[PDB]
Every structure is written in C-alpha cells, then in structure tokens.
C-alpha cells in the first residue's frame, strides 16, 4: 500500500505538471447516442472510426460553463482526469476543443449507472453494498493520497462495468487541495454539515459522502431527504439519523462513525486515517487485495448484448451539435 501509493504519486505528479492537450478532432468519431445530460453539456456514446472503438465523449458548451462560472472547475476536471490512473476510475482517452466546446473522450462503461439498478432493485443486501463500498474506499485512499478531494459521490456518478465493478466518472468538482477549501459544491443529499455550514473543509467530506452512499445502497433511500434542498440541509446539520431495522449492528456502527457531525471524531479523518474504516467490523470479510485485483466474486453483473449496446441507460432527447464560425471563449480555456 504505502509503497504502492508512493510509486503512484510520482506518475500523477509528472502528469500533473505536463498535462496533455488536443489529442483528437471531432470528425474522427461517430456520434451515436446521449447517455447522460447536464447543466452545460451531454455525454455521448461515440465511435472512433479509425479503431472501431466506442467511448463516452463529454461535450461542454464553453459559453454555458462561463455563464455558470465553472471555468476553474472544468479546468480541474480535465487536468486531474488525464493525470490519475486506478482500476476504479474511468480512463480519459482524449481531449480537444473547437470554436464552440470542450471534449473529453472517456471509456464507455457498458453496465449503466449504479443509480439505475438500485432504483429498480430497491435496496442492496449488505454483502452487495460492501462489495461496492470497498471499491470506493480504496479509490478515496488513492485520490486523497494525491491531495485530491472528489466531492460528488452519489449513485448517479458510479457506473458498473462488464465485470460488475465500479467506475467513478464525473470529476467536475475534483480538486487538488492541501489545506481547507470553501466552494459550496456537490449534491444536496450528500453534503457534509461543514460544507453547508460554510466553514471551510478538507477530505473529511468524502468520508461523510461515503457514509451516505452505503446508507442509500443498503436501505434503498438517503439518510436525509425532503422535497426541497433547504429541508435536506436542515436535516444534515441536525445530526439525527434513524436506521432501518434491517441494518446489522456492525453496519449501524460503521455508519454512526462515518456520519459524524463532529469531524474530530469522524472515521477517515482520525489519527489512523483510512485504516479505521478498512479495519471496521463490517469490513472484516473484505479482501482488499483481492478487490484491488478484481479477483473477487462480483455479486451482480449487468450483462449487455455487444459493443455499442446502450440498454442500461435511459433515453434522452437528442440535441444537435452546433460549432460556431467564431472561436468562443479562447482565453478562458487556453490551457484546455
């Protein structure tokens, strides 16, 4: 581990310092189908005509990123993405830009979102949830070691691959920060109290978010929900959680620690670091080595029927790609 991460820091640092740019053109890909949508872009199943491969291309409208004041965050995204390398993060294959947008051609993860299966299935058994937790545990342990904060953990951002393993996408709020940070970021249901409480924060928010994840997986719903975010924030900062009667005692106690308002008492943030979690009773059966190697029995395998099969994703209206005769936000994005 410490040795592993040690070697790991070095490749990221090289990449951090000399981030890559413009590794392709639009016309080398064949646009096939929107897999997801968002405030200022859509992810598309795309086909590389020279290789006959499929990727997920993220298309960011430059003007809309500017209107929404998301330039830095967008920059962090591409820079951190091309620099990292772990078995549970999606691979950035290319990036380029045109007069009108920014592109990130990532690897097409066929299994669909975790969100989708969990919604349909209802709730996951502890063992099935634990399979997935362990994978975010290591992923955070890697991420944090590089002074990165993930900041957007939710079922919608975790994808399942052919082998029933996790693939974390969306690094739109990922930030390399040594010391506290202040942006109100994320999804309401997953915000740590410090964040809603405008009090500057660190990595500890990633362990509270994980505490929420495990809860939504095992019980089928978030520990704090209401109809409007203000009502949710209120619950989050109250520090009052009710646990489903079907939660094991070990799970109830992992969750009490992970969802600790007092961040000088919150697991992951303590003296012994990430070991407090990796050594918790709930996890006693987990073989972290076997899991990092992808040699564990995957509890569920979404099966798909061939390349380009997009039946694990919901349908979205197709908006048409428009690329201006005039370069749009040159200076703002020159480092992209």
């Amino acid at each position: 581990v410490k040795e592993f991460l040690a070697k790991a820091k070095e490749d990221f640092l090289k990449k951090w310092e000399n981030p890559a740019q413009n590794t392709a053109h639009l016309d080398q890909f064949e646009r096939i189908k929107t897999l997801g949508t968002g405030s200022f872009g859509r992810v598309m199943l795309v086909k590389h005509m020279e290789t006959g491969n499929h990727y997920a291309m993220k298309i960011l409208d430059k003007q809309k990123v500017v209107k929404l004041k998301q330039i830095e965050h967008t920059l962090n995204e591409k820079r951190i993405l091309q620099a990292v390398n772990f078995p549970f993060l999606v691979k950035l294959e290319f990036s380029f830009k045109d007069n009108s947008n920014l592109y990130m051609v990532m690897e097409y993860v066929p299994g669909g979102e975790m969100f989708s299966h969990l919604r349909r299935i209802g709730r996951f058994s502890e063992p099935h949830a634990r399979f997935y937790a362990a994978q975010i545990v290591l992923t955070f342990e890697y991420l944090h070691s590089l002074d990165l904060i993930y900041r957007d953990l939710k079922p919608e951002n975790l994808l399942i691959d052919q082998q029933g393993y996790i693939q974390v996408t969306d690094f739109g709020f990922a930030k390399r920060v040594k010391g506290r940070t202040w942006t109100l970021c994320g999804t309401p249901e997953y915000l740590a109290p410090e964040i809603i409480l405008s009090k500057g924060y660190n990595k500890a928010v990633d362990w509270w978010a994980l505490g929420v994840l495990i809860y939504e997986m095992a019980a089928g719903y978030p520990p704090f929900f209401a109809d409007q975010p203000i009502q949710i924030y209120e619950k989050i900062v109250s520090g009052k959680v009710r646990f489903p009667s079907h939660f094991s005692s070990d799970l109830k106690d992992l969750l009490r620690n992970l969802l600790q308002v007092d961040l000088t008492k919150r697991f992951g943030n303590l003296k012994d670091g990430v070991n407090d979690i990796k050594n918790h009773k709930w996890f006693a059966t987990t073989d972290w080595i076997a899991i990092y190697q992808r040699k564990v029995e995957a509890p569920f395998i979404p099966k798909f029927k061939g390349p380009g099969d997009t039946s694990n994703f919901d349908d979205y209206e197709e908006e048409e790609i428009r690329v201006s005769i005039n370069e749009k936000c040159g200076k703002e994005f020159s480092e992209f």
């Binding site: 004041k69 709020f173 970021c185 978030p222 975010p229």
Partner: peptide, 20 residues
Amino acid sequence: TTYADFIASGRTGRRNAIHD
C-alpha cells in the same frame, strides 16, 4: 414507512449538482 415516504417524494430521480 420511510420507503413509502421516499417514493412519494420529489427527489427519487437523478439528483442534480448544486453549482451557484
């Protein structure tokens, strides 16, 4: 039930990220 209470609610679908 909390499950019932959850399905009847407004945030059962894909949750969006809070920017500004």
